[PDB]
Amino acid sequence: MISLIAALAVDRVIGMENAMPWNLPADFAWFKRNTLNKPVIMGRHTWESIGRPLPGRKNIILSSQPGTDDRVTWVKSVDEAIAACGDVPEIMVIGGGRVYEQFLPKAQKLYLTHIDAEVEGDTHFPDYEPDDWESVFSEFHDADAQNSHSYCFEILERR
């Protein structure tokens, strides 16, 4: 099963100049808990933004060109990316915008963090069809001393 995990600010903004333009440690804990011990697929720009493999996860990088780092597994197509994960219960697609768009039609689950932040961005999550998805988990949190925005963790399953 293929899942997408993403954090979305107002208007589905996910990124600006190769970063996530907000401060939300609660989302790091959610991301780690839901990706650890699962393979993660990401695009080259997202890979370049992290600089080092995510520990405890098989890191698969999509790029049309030959790989440049043997600490991760490089693939040249969506189907090769999926194949490189082998037979696992759940594959996690972790971004960015262009990768999310291509995996959305193949995904059965979305893990979304909806962040109440107004941010300018140059990257947005795809415009998913709400009727195709059932919300199976939704937990809202107010801002606190560590998290400067309110946020809501949501899991949606494809109907």
Ligand X SMILES: NC(=O)C1=CN([C@@H]2O[C@H](COP(=O)(O)OP(=O)(O)OC[C@H]3O[C@@H](n4cnc5c(N)ncnc54)[C@H](OP(=O)(O)O)[C@@H]3O)[C@@H](O)[C@H]2O)C=CC1
Distance (Å, whole) CA 110 – CA 108 = 7
Q: Which residues are annotated as a binding site?
A: 5, 7, 13-19, 27, 45-46, 52, 57, 63-64, 76, 95-102, 113
Distance (Å, whole) CA 89 – CA 74 = 21
Distance (Å, whole) CA 77 – CA 22 = 31
Q: Which residues are annotated as a binding site for NADP(+)?
A: 7, 13-19, 45-46, 63-64, 76, 95-102
Q: Which is nearer to Ca ion, 24 or 93 (CB)?
A: 24
Q: Is residue 84 involved in binding ligand X (CB under 6 A)?
A: no
Q: How far is the CB of 2 from ligand X (least distance, A)?
A: 14
Residue owning tokens 């082998």: 86
Q: Which of residues 80-119 bind Ca ion (CB under 5 A)?
A: 116-117
Residue owning tokens 């933004």: 49
Q: Is residue 95 involved in binding ligand X (CB under 6 A)?
A: yes
Q: How far is the CB of 19 from ligand X (least distance, A)?
A: 5
Tell me, residue by residue from 15 to 54, as one string, x for binding to ligand X by CB under 6 A and - for no binding: x--xxx---------------------xxxxx--x-----
| CA–CA distances in Å: residue 10 to residues 23, 76, 118, 155 | 14, 32, 6, 18
Q: Which is nearer to Ca ion, 81 or 117 (CB)?
A: 117
First-residue to last-residue Cα distance in the chain:
14
Considering CB under 6 A, how many residues would be counted as binding ligand X? 28
| Residue 3: strand, helix, or coil | strand
Q: Do the beta carbons of residue 36 and residue 57 sit within 8 Å?
A: yes
**Which of Ca ion, ligand X, none sits in contact with 49, Cβ below 5 to 8 A by type?**
ligand X
